[PDB]
Amino acid sequence: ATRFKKNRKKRGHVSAGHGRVGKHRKHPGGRGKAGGLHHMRINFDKYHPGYFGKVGMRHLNLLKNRTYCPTINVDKLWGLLPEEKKKEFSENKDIAPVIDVTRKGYFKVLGNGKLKHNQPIVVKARYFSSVAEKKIKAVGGQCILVA
Amino acid sequence: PNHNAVRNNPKINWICNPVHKHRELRGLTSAGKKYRGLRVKGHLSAKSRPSIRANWKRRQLIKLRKCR
Amino acid sequence: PTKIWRRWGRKVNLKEKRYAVCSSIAASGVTSLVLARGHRISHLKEVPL
Amino acid sequence: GRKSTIKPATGIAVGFNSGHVVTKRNSKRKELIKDVVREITGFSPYEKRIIELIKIGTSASTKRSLKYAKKKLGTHKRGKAKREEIQKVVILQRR
Amino acid sequence: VAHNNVLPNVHLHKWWQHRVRVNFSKNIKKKKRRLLREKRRKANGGTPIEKLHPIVHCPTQRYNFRTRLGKGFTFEELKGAGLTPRAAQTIGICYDKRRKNRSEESLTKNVERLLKYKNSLVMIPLKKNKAKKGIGGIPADADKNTIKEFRNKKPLLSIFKKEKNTKPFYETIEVSKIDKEFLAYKTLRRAKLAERRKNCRQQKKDIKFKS
RNA sequence: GAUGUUAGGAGGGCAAAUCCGCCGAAUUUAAGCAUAUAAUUAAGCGGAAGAAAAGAAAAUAACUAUGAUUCCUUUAGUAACGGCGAGUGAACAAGGACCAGCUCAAACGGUUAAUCCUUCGUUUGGUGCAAACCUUUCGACGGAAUUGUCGUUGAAUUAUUCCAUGAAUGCCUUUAAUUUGAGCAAAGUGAGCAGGAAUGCUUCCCCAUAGAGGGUGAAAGGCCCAUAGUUCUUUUUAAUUUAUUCAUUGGAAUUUUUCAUGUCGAGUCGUGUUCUUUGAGAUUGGAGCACUAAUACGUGUGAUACAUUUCACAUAAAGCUAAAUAUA
RNA sequence: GGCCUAUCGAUCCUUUAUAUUUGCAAAAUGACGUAAAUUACUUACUACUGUGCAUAUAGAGGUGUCUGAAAAGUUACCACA
């Protein structure tokens, strides 16, 4: 590291890139974040607007696992299925694939994207979007609510 | 801890070990257990359970690997 | 003052590590490279030995 | 939210009785001591004051009694429980 | 702070320099741990030192699908196995006293796991050459030819590790065996909405039952 | 309750890196400063150990639930706390290291405390050159304790099945590991040249499971000690190998069938109040004081004060406990 | 809004307005409402559900050293940068 440094470029140069007039001294507005709103208000407003104030109620112990949400879009739902298996479903009009999204790790299925027309599929999940549901019904698939 | 009956007795016998010199000044008594909070368990003891010293040192400690 | 805080080690990545070994073995393969590396190759009788 | 032992859970996993498919499988000596100890110890002065309020028996005195009992013992529940002991003693006293 | 730089979140204002530790012992510590357990196993005649756990469920909404090694079998599973607590301590199965054995399916699975271990297990004679039928649901004492022959072989310790689950789950279903009827989004919202009405009803049920 | 240079014992003090207690600041930060910050840090006084303390549920959850402790990875710079400014800040789950249990106490046992200890003794083993240790049951004589030691862990009763037990004869074989001190340990002190003198230069030989290292009159595999390799002797702890008859006494586990459904730590919890502390927020922990509880279908929990009611989970106010872990 | 060019104030806080919108963390407090059922923890179906606190949105209560410290004197005893 040491051999490429800016100090190696400026080694005999007095203030050495930090201003001869200035005469370089540490934290000269005050420490850390401290000059925010007072002296650095212009910086904080222009670069970090919504910083100051108090907004919303409090939830004292959040416990993030209770409200856990692993999603997939309908767009990538078919992508959980292999190519050759998918070709077999495309070929065979008489059958549809069941997809357990939870067994593949997901709880909610959302509505971004395309389902291929005239091609039933069975989707098992805890949660589905209104749009996802509409698409599954539209393509003649089935939705399974499952725990 | 010296006398033969207590050394002989399997009950209480543990007290004969030299760590029981000044139990109250280590706070191991029921009174000591109280003010160190060792009666308290669960989330009411969260900042205190392994010891007040211990818990704080664990929380304070910054641990670095060789390759980070 | 020097302290043991210093970042001496590095994480060298699994795929990269494997690539380096494979590519070095492939490089070791090449006869011209062996001689360039300074091995006295003249009386050797196959390209990998 | 509760699963309910009677009637198995629905597969939805929201609302009451819901979630994954599953099957669940589910004195006298001391009383004599207490009466003897009461013969020995009688009633505490606050217990006695409550007995007098309860004996008066008005809605005002009873309301006062619960407030006084909460104030003296701490908690509404402890006060109500003590009031129940006093009512029982008053029932005994009458007979 | 200046320019486009994010606000910092460091806590190095307290005297951290005597509250900091750097690990240079890692790989040697790992070697020492390996050496310690290897030495221990060898001292025990090379016999297993491994502990057989019950399979138990991982908790809450997030992990309810998953299952892991638990603290100990406990009495109902042990009774279903036909094994005593004393036997459970004597053998390699994990021990407990306050883990409830819960639902039927979990208990039935763990008694089957116990039964698998029980069938698997071979027990060396206590006093060597004074063989007995013995206690606790533990196997009767092994013969000398078999135990020697078994000693020469590797122990089979696969069952200790966590099991895998269904590899594809992509299964076929015929078109006329499924339907388009369902309204899942409606069902969810209604289910949450009707919770209040049910909770009130259930409280009244609970009061009636208790009466 | 005194008193004893009565007879037998113990403590004191030192050392401190890590450990455990108390008691306990400020420089500093906010470009000022008061709350906050430094920090429950330093100093002070105490106690310990080769680790200590902690630890067997008055726990977490709301699941398809988990289930003593410690540690790591993490959650997480997050919920939260904050002149909501500066700034501060957890826990649970999951992946792992590693995992070990238990007993006082009530309760139960009175045609007998079934206990305990000192002093005096006494013999069945085993080492060691010797000092000496180590096992070993049996009696006294003193005391102690019923104001409660010992046994028991609901109570009997059935069948099953183990363990202690005592005597005679038999028998201590072989190895494998593991770990000390010990040893032995390959070939040149060959020409020639210049040199104070090679371990140099050449050149003719070689040895290597030793071409690590050190010393040796200039850089040495062959000069020496060493090294690699082995031969033992040492530590313990595995496997293997061998027991057979004859004998009482005692205990324990399941299993039937009856019958007992008893029990569970108070000036403590709690509440109020005050001061402190934290993540604790209309009070998280501590402490002072005031008021002061309920008995197991109780009462302690389920993070916003409350009433009224659910449901889940636990069993406070007695006690101990290896391991992973830390060590300037 | 005043013929035009003047007539005024952040965050935090308090306060009153406002809502078929919300929360107080395992649950509940209209109302057993409307139906059926009747051995009971029965079974459906219902936009309008306790006190208190928290929000969210909208004002107002003020900072005139007016882009916002809760702040009097004094040193001829003085020190330092």
Short mmCIF file of N, CA and C in Angstrom, two decimals, chain A residues 28-106:
data_model
loop_
_atom_site.label_atom_id
_atom_site.label_comp_id
_atom_site.label_asym_id
_atom_site.label_seq_id
_atom_site.Cartn_x
_atom_site.Cartn_y
_atom_site.Cartn_z
N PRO A 28 -12.55 21.47 11.96
CA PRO A 28 -12.47 22.87 12.36
C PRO A 28 -13.85 23.50 12.34
N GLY A 29 -14.92 22.72 12.11
CA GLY A 29 -16.29 23.16 12.35
C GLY A 29 -16.84 22.63 13.64
N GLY A 30 -16.08 21.73 14.32
CA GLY A 30 -16.57 20.87 15.39
C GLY A 30 -16.68 19.42 14.96
N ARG A 31 -16.78 18.50 15.94
CA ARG A 31 -16.83 17.05 15.74
C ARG A 31 -17.98 16.45 14.92
N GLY A 32 -17.70 15.32 14.24
CA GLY A 32 -18.70 14.40 13.68
C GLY A 32 -19.84 14.99 12.89
N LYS A 33 -21.08 14.66 13.30
CA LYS A 33 -22.29 15.07 12.63
C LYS A 33 -22.80 16.37 13.23
N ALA A 34 -22.09 16.89 14.23
CA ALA A 34 -22.62 17.84 15.17
C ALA A 34 -23.09 19.17 14.62
N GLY A 35 -22.41 19.69 13.57
CA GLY A 35 -22.78 20.98 12.99
C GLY A 35 -24.03 20.95 12.15
N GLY A 36 -24.63 19.77 11.91
CA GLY A 36 -25.95 19.61 11.29
C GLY A 36 -27.02 20.54 11.84
N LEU A 37 -27.87 21.09 10.95
CA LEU A 37 -28.92 22.08 11.23
C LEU A 37 -28.41 23.45 11.68
N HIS A 38 -27.24 23.51 12.31
CA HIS A 38 -26.68 24.71 12.89
C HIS A 38 -25.74 25.41 11.95
N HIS A 39 -24.80 24.66 11.38
CA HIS A 39 -23.69 25.19 10.61
C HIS A 39 -23.55 24.45 9.29
N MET A 40 -23.98 23.18 9.27
CA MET A 40 -23.97 22.30 8.12
C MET A 40 -25.39 22.07 7.63
N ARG A 41 -26.32 23.01 7.90
CA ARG A 41 -27.72 22.84 7.56
C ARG A 41 -27.91 22.71 6.07
N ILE A 42 -27.18 23.55 5.31
CA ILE A 42 -27.17 23.55 3.87
C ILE A 42 -26.75 22.21 3.29
N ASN A 43 -25.67 21.58 3.80
CA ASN A 43 -25.30 20.23 3.42
C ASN A 43 -26.39 19.21 3.76
N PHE A 44 -26.87 19.19 5.02
CA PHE A 44 -27.85 18.21 5.44
C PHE A 44 -29.16 18.34 4.67
N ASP A 45 -29.68 19.56 4.48
CA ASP A 45 -30.86 19.80 3.67
C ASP A 45 -30.71 19.35 2.22
N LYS A 46 -29.54 19.60 1.59
CA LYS A 46 -29.31 19.33 0.19
C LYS A 46 -28.98 17.87 -0.08
N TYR A 47 -28.50 17.13 0.92
CA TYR A 47 -27.99 15.79 0.69
C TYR A 47 -28.69 14.74 1.54
N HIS A 48 -29.37 15.13 2.63
CA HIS A 48 -30.04 14.22 3.54
C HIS A 48 -31.32 14.86 4.09
N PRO A 49 -32.27 15.30 3.26
CA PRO A 49 -33.40 16.14 3.67
C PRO A 49 -34.15 15.72 4.93
N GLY A 50 -34.76 14.51 4.95
CA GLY A 50 -35.76 14.13 5.95
C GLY A 50 -35.22 13.73 7.29
N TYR A 51 -33.99 14.17 7.62
CA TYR A 51 -33.24 13.81 8.79
C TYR A 51 -33.85 14.29 10.12
N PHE A 52 -34.26 15.57 10.21
CA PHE A 52 -34.64 16.14 11.49
C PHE A 52 -36.14 16.05 11.77
N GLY A 53 -36.49 15.84 13.05
CA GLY A 53 -37.86 15.76 13.55
C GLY A 53 -38.24 14.43 14.14
N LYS A 54 -39.52 14.28 14.54
CA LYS A 54 -40.07 13.04 15.06
C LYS A 54 -41.32 12.65 14.29
N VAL A 55 -41.36 11.46 13.65
CA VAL A 55 -42.49 11.04 12.82
C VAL A 55 -42.96 9.64 13.19
N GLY A 56 -44.29 9.47 13.37
CA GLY A 56 -44.97 8.22 13.64
C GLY A 56 -44.99 7.77 15.08
N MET A 57 -46.00 6.94 15.42
CA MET A 57 -46.06 6.11 16.61
C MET A 57 -44.83 5.22 16.85
N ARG A 58 -44.75 4.53 18.00
CA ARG A 58 -43.70 3.55 18.25
C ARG A 58 -44.24 2.15 18.47
N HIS A 59 -43.47 1.14 18.03
CA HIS A 59 -43.76 -0.26 18.26
C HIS A 59 -42.60 -0.81 19.06
N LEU A 60 -42.81 -1.04 20.37
CA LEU A 60 -41.73 -1.19 21.32
C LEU A 60 -40.80 -2.39 21.12
N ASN A 61 -41.34 -3.58 20.76
CA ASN A 61 -40.51 -4.71 20.39
C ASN A 61 -40.98 -5.22 19.04
N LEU A 62 -40.26 -4.92 17.94
CA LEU A 62 -40.72 -5.21 16.59
C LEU A 62 -40.89 -6.70 16.26
N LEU A 63 -39.87 -7.53 16.58
CA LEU A 63 -39.87 -8.97 16.35
C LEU A 63 -40.13 -9.39 14.90
N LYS A 64 -39.25 -8.93 13.98
CA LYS A 64 -39.34 -8.98 12.53
C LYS A 64 -39.73 -10.32 11.88
N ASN A 65 -39.45 -11.45 12.55
CA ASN A 65 -39.82 -12.78 12.11
C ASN A 65 -41.33 -13.00 12.10
N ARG A 66 -42.09 -12.34 13.00
CA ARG A 66 -43.54 -12.42 13.06
C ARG A 66 -44.21 -11.99 11.75
N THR A 67 -43.69 -10.93 11.12
CA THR A 67 -44.26 -10.31 9.93
C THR A 67 -43.46 -10.63 8.68
N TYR A 68 -42.63 -11.69 8.71
CA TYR A 68 -41.72 -12.08 7.64
C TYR A 68 -42.38 -12.26 6.27
N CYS A 69 -41.71 -11.79 5.20
CA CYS A 69 -42.32 -11.73 3.88
C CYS A 69 -41.35 -12.07 2.75
N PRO A 70 -41.26 -13.33 2.35
CA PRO A 70 -40.53 -13.72 1.16
C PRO A 70 -41.48 -13.80 -0.02
N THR A 71 -41.28 -12.93 -1.02
CA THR A 71 -42.16 -12.81 -2.18
C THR A 71 -41.60 -13.43 -3.45
N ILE A 72 -42.49 -13.73 -4.41
CA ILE A 72 -42.14 -13.97 -5.80
C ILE A 72 -43.19 -13.30 -6.66
N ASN A 73 -42.80 -12.78 -7.83
CA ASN A 73 -43.74 -12.40 -8.86
C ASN A 73 -44.14 -13.59 -9.71
N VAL A 74 -45.35 -13.54 -10.28
CA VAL A 74 -45.87 -14.49 -11.24
C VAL A 74 -44.91 -14.67 -12.41
N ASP A 75 -44.31 -13.57 -12.93
CA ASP A 75 -43.24 -13.60 -13.91
C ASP A 75 -42.16 -14.68 -13.69
N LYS A 76 -41.65 -14.82 -12.44
CA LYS A 76 -40.61 -15.77 -12.12
C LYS A 76 -41.14 -17.08 -11.56
N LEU A 77 -42.47 -17.24 -11.44
CA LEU A 77 -43.09 -18.46 -10.93
C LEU A 77 -42.79 -19.68 -11.78
N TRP A 78 -42.95 -19.57 -13.12
CA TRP A 78 -42.57 -20.59 -14.07
C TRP A 78 -41.08 -20.91 -14.01
N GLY A 79 -40.24 -19.92 -13.64
CA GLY A 79 -38.80 -20.06 -13.56
C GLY A 79 -38.33 -20.97 -12.46
N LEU A 80 -39.18 -21.24 -11.47
CA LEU A 80 -38.90 -22.24 -10.46
C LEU A 80 -38.97 -23.66 -11.01
N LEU A 81 -39.57 -23.83 -12.20
CA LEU A 81 -39.70 -25.10 -12.88
C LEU A 81 -38.57 -25.27 -13.89
N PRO A 82 -37.82 -26.37 -13.92
CA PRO A 82 -36.91 -26.75 -15.00
C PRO A 82 -37.40 -26.64 -16.43
N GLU A 83 -36.48 -26.43 -17.38
CA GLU A 83 -36.76 -26.28 -18.80
C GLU A 83 -37.39 -27.50 -19.43
N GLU A 84 -36.82 -28.69 -19.24
CA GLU A 84 -37.35 -29.91 -19.83
C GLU A 84 -38.72 -30.30 -19.30
N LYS A 85 -38.94 -30.17 -17.98
CA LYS A 85 -40.24 -30.34 -17.34
C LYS A 85 -41.29 -29.39 -17.89
N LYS A 86 -40.92 -28.11 -18.05
CA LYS A 86 -41.75 -27.09 -18.65
C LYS A 86 -42.15 -27.40 -20.08
N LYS A 87 -41.21 -27.92 -20.90
CA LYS A 87 -41.48 -28.42 -22.23
C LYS A 87 -42.49 -29.54 -22.25
N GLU A 88 -42.39 -30.50 -21.31
CA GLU A 88 -43.39 -31.54 -21.14
C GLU A 88 -44.78 -31.01 -20.82
N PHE A 89 -44.90 -30.02 -19.93
CA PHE A 89 -46.16 -29.34 -19.67
C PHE A 89 -46.71 -28.58 -20.87
N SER A 90 -45.84 -27.90 -21.64
CA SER A 90 -46.20 -27.23 -22.88
C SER A 90 -46.75 -28.20 -23.92
N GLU A 91 -46.07 -29.35 -24.11
CA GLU A 91 -46.52 -30.44 -24.95
C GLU A 91 -47.88 -31.03 -24.55
N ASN A 92 -48.09 -31.29 -23.25
CA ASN A 92 -49.22 -32.08 -22.80
C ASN A 92 -50.33 -31.21 -22.26
N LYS A 93 -51.36 -31.00 -23.09
CA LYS A 93 -52.50 -30.13 -22.87
C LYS A 93 -53.36 -30.56 -21.69
N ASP A 94 -53.39 -31.86 -21.43
CA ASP A 94 -54.19 -32.56 -20.47
C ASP A 94 -53.75 -32.40 -19.01
N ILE A 95 -52.53 -31.91 -18.75
CA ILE A 95 -52.00 -31.78 -17.40
C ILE A 95 -51.42 -30.40 -17.16
N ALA A 96 -51.28 -30.05 -15.87
CA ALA A 96 -50.72 -28.80 -15.40
C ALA A 96 -49.67 -29.09 -14.32
N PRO A 97 -48.71 -28.22 -14.08
CA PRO A 97 -47.73 -28.41 -13.02
C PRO A 97 -48.24 -27.84 -11.72
N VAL A 98 -48.12 -28.58 -10.62
CA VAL A 98 -48.23 -28.01 -9.30
C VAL A 98 -46.90 -27.42 -8.87
N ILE A 99 -46.92 -26.19 -8.32
CA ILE A 99 -45.77 -25.49 -7.80
C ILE A 99 -46.03 -25.12 -6.35
N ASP A 100 -45.28 -25.74 -5.43
CA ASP A 100 -45.28 -25.36 -4.04
C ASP A 100 -44.24 -24.28 -3.80
N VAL A 101 -44.68 -23.01 -3.78
CA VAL A 101 -43.78 -21.88 -3.65
C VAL A 101 -43.14 -21.80 -2.28
N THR A 102 -43.86 -22.23 -1.22
CA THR A 102 -43.40 -22.26 0.16
C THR A 102 -42.35 -23.31 0.38
N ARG A 103 -42.51 -24.49 -0.22
CA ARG A 103 -41.50 -25.53 -0.22
C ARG A 103 -40.24 -25.09 -0.97
N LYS A 104 -40.39 -24.14 -1.92
CA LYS A 104 -39.28 -23.46 -2.56
C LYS A 104 -38.88 -22.16 -1.84
N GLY A 105 -39.55 -21.81 -0.71
CA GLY A 105 -39.17 -20.74 0.19
C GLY A 105 -39.96 -19.45 0.19
N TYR A 106 -41.12 -19.36 -0.47
CA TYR A 106 -41.85 -18.10 -0.61
C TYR A 106 -43.23 -18.15 0.02
#
